Amino acid sequence: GMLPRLCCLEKGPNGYGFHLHGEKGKLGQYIRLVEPGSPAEKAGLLAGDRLVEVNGENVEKETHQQVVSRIRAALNAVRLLVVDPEEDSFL
Ligand SMILES: [Cl-]
Ligand SMILES: [Cl-]
């Protein structure tokens, strides 16, 4: 609706099933390569999505390493708050 899409994935045997990546100069992390049939795909993630929060914490301006660390440390699940970058901007 109005709220950013919230994607709640349960960690599977083969991880979550998606890549995360930044872009030189333009800080920020983005979903990339979502595997068919994975938690990521089941939870609604889409390559192209920008990652705003991981488990209720703002990671919009955090390094690639910080964000991956956070995602990786959670135990069973991660809630990923994403927006479509063509429709959302931070000010
Ligand atoms: Cl991709
Ligand atoms: Cl959005």
UniProtKB/Swiss-Prot annotation:
Ranges of residues in domain PDZ: 6-86
GO cellular component: actin cytoskeleton; apical plasma membrane; brush border membrane; cell periphery; cytoplasm; endomembrane system; extracellular exosome; filopodium
UniProt keyword annotations, A-Z: Acetylation, Cell membrane, Cell projection, Cytoplasm, Disease variant, Membrane, Osteoporosis, Phosphoprotein, Repeat, Wnt signaling pathway
A molecular function (GO) term: PDZ domain binding
Main localization category: cytoplasm
Tissue: Detected in liver, kidney, pancreas, prostate, spleen, small intestine and placenta, in particular in the syncytiotrophoblast.
GO BP terms: actin cytoskeleton organization; adenylate cyclase-activating dopamine receptor signaling pathway; auditory receptor cell stereocilium organization; bile acid secretion; cerebrospinal fluid circulation; cilium organization; establishment of epithelial cell apical/basal polarity; establishment of Golgi localization
Upregulation: By estrogen.
Cellular localisation: Cytoplasm; Apical cell membrane; Endomembrane system; Cell projection, Filopodium
Modified residues (Phosphoserine): 38
Subunit description: Homodimer, and heterodimer with NHERF2. Binds the N-termini of EZR, RDX and MSN. Binds the C-termini of PDGFRA, PDGFRB, ADRB2, NOS2 and CFTR. Binds ARHGAP17, EPI64, RACK1, OPRK1, GNAQ, CTNNB1 and PLCB3. Binds PDZK1. Interacts with CLCN3. Binds the C-terminus of PAG1. In resting T-cells, part of a PAG1-NHERF1-MSN complex which is disrupted upon TCR activation. Forms a complex with CFTR and SLC4A7. Forms a complex with SLC4A7 and ATP6V1B1. Interacts with TRPC4 (via the PDZ-binding domain). Directly interacts with HTR4.
Function: Scaffold protein that connects plasma membrane proteins with members of the ezrin/moesin/radixin family and thereby helps to link them to the actin cytoskeleton and to regulate their surface expression. Necessary for recycling of internalized ADRB2. Was first known to play a role in the regulation of the activity and subcellular location of SLC9A3. Necessary for cAMP-mediated phosphorylation and inhibition of SLC9A3. May enhance Wnt signaling. May participate in HTR4 targeting to microvilli. Involved in the regulation of phosphate reabsorption in the renal proximal tubules.
Disorder cited: Nephrolithiasis/osteoporosis, hypophosphatemic, 2: A disease characterized by decreased renal phosphate absorption, renal phosphate wasting, hypophosphatemia, hyperphosphaturia, hypercalciuria, nephrolithiasis and osteoporosis.
The protein's name: Na(+)/H(+) exchange regulatory cofactor NHE-RF1
Gene field: NHERF1
Full protein: residues contained: 11 to 94 of 358
